Amino acid sequence: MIERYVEFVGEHEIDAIFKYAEKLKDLSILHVNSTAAGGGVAEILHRLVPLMRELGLNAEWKVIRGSQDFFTVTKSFHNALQTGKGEIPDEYFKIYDEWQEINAGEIPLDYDVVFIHDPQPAGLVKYRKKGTWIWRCHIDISNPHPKVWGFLRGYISKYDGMIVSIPEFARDDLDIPQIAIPPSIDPLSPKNMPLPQTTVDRIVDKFGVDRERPIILQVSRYDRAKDPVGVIESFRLAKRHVPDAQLVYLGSPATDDPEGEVVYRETVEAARGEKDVHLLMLPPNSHVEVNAFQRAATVVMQKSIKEGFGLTVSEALWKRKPVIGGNTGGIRIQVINGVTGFLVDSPKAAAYYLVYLLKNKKVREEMGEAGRDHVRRNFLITQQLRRYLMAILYLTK
Numbered sequence: 001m002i003e004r005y006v007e008f009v010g011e012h013e014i015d016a017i018f019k020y021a022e023k024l025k026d027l028s029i030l031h032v033n034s035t036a037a038g039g040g041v042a043e044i045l046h047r048l049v050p051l052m053r054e055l056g057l058n059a060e061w062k063v064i065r066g067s068q069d070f071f072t073v074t075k076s077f078h079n080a081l082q083t084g085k086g087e088i089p090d091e092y093f094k095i096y097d098e099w100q101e102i103n104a105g106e107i108p109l110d111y112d113v114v115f116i117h118d119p120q121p122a123g124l125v126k127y128r129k130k131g132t133w134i135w136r137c138h139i140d141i142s143n144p145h146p147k148v149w150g151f152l153r154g155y156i157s158k159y160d161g162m163i164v165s166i167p168e169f170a171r172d173d174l175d176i177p178q179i180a181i182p183p184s185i186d187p188l189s190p191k192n193m194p195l196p197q198t199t200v201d202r203i204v205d206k207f208g209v210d211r212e213r214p215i216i217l218q219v220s221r222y223d224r225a226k227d228p229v230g231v232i233e234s235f236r237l238a239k240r241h242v243p244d245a246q247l248v249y250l251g252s253p254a255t256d257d258p259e260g261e262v263v264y265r266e267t268v269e270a271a272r273g274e275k276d277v278h279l280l281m282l283p284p285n286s287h288v289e290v291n292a293f294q295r296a297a298t299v300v301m302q303k304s305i306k307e308g309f310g311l312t313v314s315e316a317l318w319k320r321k322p323v324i325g326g327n328t329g330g331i332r333i334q335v336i337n338g339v340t341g342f343l344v345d346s347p348k349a350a351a352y353y354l355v356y357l358l359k360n361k362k363v364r365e366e367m368g369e370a371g372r373d374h375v376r377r378n379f380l381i382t383q384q385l386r387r388y389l390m391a392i393l394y395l396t397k
């Protein structure tokens with residue numbers, strides 16, 4: 001399995017992974033998250049944990065269960081931490097704590113290393129036994145809702161360490177080690193592997209999208225932080241100068257997002273009037289369909305208001321597509337302004353750069369190549385895996 005990555009990263013990184021893994025062969029490692037299918041965390045763990053096993057680590061991945069009430073609370077925490085907005089009643093904290101207790105009763109926590117992914121299972125640390133506990137934060141916690149952060153910091157401050165996606169998310173109100181590890185893409189997954197043109201054509205055709213006209217694509221949940229409405233507004237402004245252009249918004253449900261269905265309707269509303277707008281909702285693990293659309297796209301957008309990293313940016317850059325990205329969080333380490341695409345602060349700036357890229361085929365192609373090179377150097381699964389092993393070795397001494 002690992003030997004296959006030599007092509008992309010060279011012998012020296014593969015040697016490094018083997019020597020780190022050799023030191024860790026005797027350790028039991030648990031990963032805990034809140035979703036089995038959908039979202040970036042499940043995307044990482046579905047590839048990362050099997051690779052840990054290939055290297056001879058005793059790695060397990062557990063998904064917590066919860067009610068709709070629990071996932072309503074966790075999503076409100078998610079939005080509050082990233083945006084600093086909203087009212088959070090004390091009832092939310094009681095619901096949160098009860099589901100930590102329920103899950104703790106059904107998870108064996110006495111692993112050498114426990115990785116807790118994102119806020120949903122952070123409270124499990126109350127029931128810790130032996131071993132090293134690491135909190136893996138996938139979101140923007142630079143400017144959080146003080147009530148939600150106050151509550152969660154009570155748990156995080158009990159961890160042995162913390163991983164954030166970029167240094168800028170490191171907290172000055174935590175004294176535990178805060179390690180920056182960017183997420184990555186697995187070039188060998190069905191999400192990112194080469195596709196034959198016949199498959200790309202067939203999937204784009206199936207969804208009624210014109211393969212002969214430009215495609216502007218955003219792959220994202222119907223979530224306010226992804227700004228599907230602002231993407232529609234970007235498209236409307238740009239279509240004035242590229243009237244043949246089409247917009248594809250490709251969304252899909254996650255287990256732990258109970259408002260994915262609500263935001264659709266204000267997207268559909270904002271879309272009514274335009275017929276080259278395609279609002280797709282695909283089942284979980286529609287890997288090949290996302291792959292195909294990313295390969296069909298002329299330009300890809302990830303115009304997030306808030307973003308921990310945004311795997312969809314690296315997925316597009318790897319397939320040699322330039323990205324127009326929201327000027328926020330981990331998008332800024334993937335989109336090198338004027339090299340791998342453009343960082344934008346408004347739909348107006350998004351539209352400006354959409355028209356520029358649609359009118360400049362040679363620039364698109366060169367930015368595409370620079371994107372793939374930037375992902376190759378920085379955001380492949382081998383790099384993320386090596387930093388995980390390094391983090392474990394450090395934090396277990």
Ligand SMILES: O=c1ccn([C@@H]2O[C@H](COP(=O)(O)OP(=O)(O)O[C@H]3O[C@H](CO)[C@@H](O)[C@H](O)[C@H]3O)[C@@H](O)[C@H]2O)c(=O)[nH]1
Pocket residue numbers: 038039040041043044138139165183191219220221250251252253282285286287290307308309310311312313315
């Ligand atoms: O219809 C869809 C929409 C998305 N995806 C995939 O789902 C993932 C989405 O990941 P990302 O764009 O990163 O978003 P989140 O689900 O919000 O992921 C969280 O965790 C990720 C990993 O750390 C970070 O990149 C994010 O910023 C963070 O919010 C990618 O693999 C997408 O291809 C699909 O397969 N189908």
